[PDB]
Amino acid sequence: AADTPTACCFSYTSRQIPQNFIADYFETSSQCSKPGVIFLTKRSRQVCADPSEEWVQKYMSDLELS
Amino acid sequence: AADTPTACCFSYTSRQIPQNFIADYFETSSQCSKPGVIFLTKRSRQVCADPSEEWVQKYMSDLELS
Ligand SMILES: [K+]
Ligand SMILES: [K+]
Incomplete structure (x- = not known):
C-alpha cells in the first residue's frame, strides 16, 4: 500500500537488544523528524533504535548478510 | 506498549471514504509534522485523512456516539 501511516521514532x-532477539529491521522514512531503525523481535515487538549507534549498524549488517 | 513507532500522516x-467502510479511527500524535486522522476500514486497511475536513469530523462523531 501507499497513502497510509508511516512509522516514526x-x-x-x-x-x-540481545542480538538473538532480532528477526528483521527497517529504516524509517526521511520524512520523520528523527532518523530511526525499527527492529522487529521474534515476538513481533517493534523497537526504535539510533542508527548512529555501533551495535545497530552491526545488527543491520548481520541481518543483510544472511 | 511505548518506545515504539508512532504512526504519522x-x-x-x-x-x-464511504461511511459504511469505516470500523474505527484515531488521531495521530502531535509529534507528527501533520495533523492526522487514521481511519481503519473493515478490511483493516489504514487510511490517512485531514481532520479539518467536514466529513471526517462527521465520521469521528458518529463513531464516538455509538
Ligand atoms: K527529516
Ligand atoms: K506538530
Whole structure:
C-alpha cells in the first residue's frame, strides 16, 4: 500500500537488544523528524533504535548478510 | 506498549471514504509534522485523512456516539 501511516521514532531504546532477539529491521522514512531503525523481535515487538549507534549498524549488517 | 513507532500522516486521502467502510479511527500524535486522522476500514486497511475536513469530523462523531 501507499497513502497510509508511516512509522516514526521519537525515542530510541536506551540499551542494546540481545542480538538473538532480532528477526528483521527497517529504516524509517526521511520524512520523520528523527532518523530511526525499527527492529522487529521474534515476538513481533517493534523497537526504535539510533542508527548512529555501533551495535545497530552491526545488527543491520548481520541481518543483510544472511 | 511505548518506545515504539508512532504512526504519522504525510498525505491525506483525496476523496471521502464511504461511511459504511469505516470500523474505527484515531488521531495521530502531535509529534507528527501533520495533523492526522487514521481511519481503519473493515478490511483493516489504514487510511490517512485531514481532520479539518467536514466529513471526517462527521465520521469521528458518529463513531464516538455509538
Ligand atoms: K527529516
Ligand atoms: K506538530
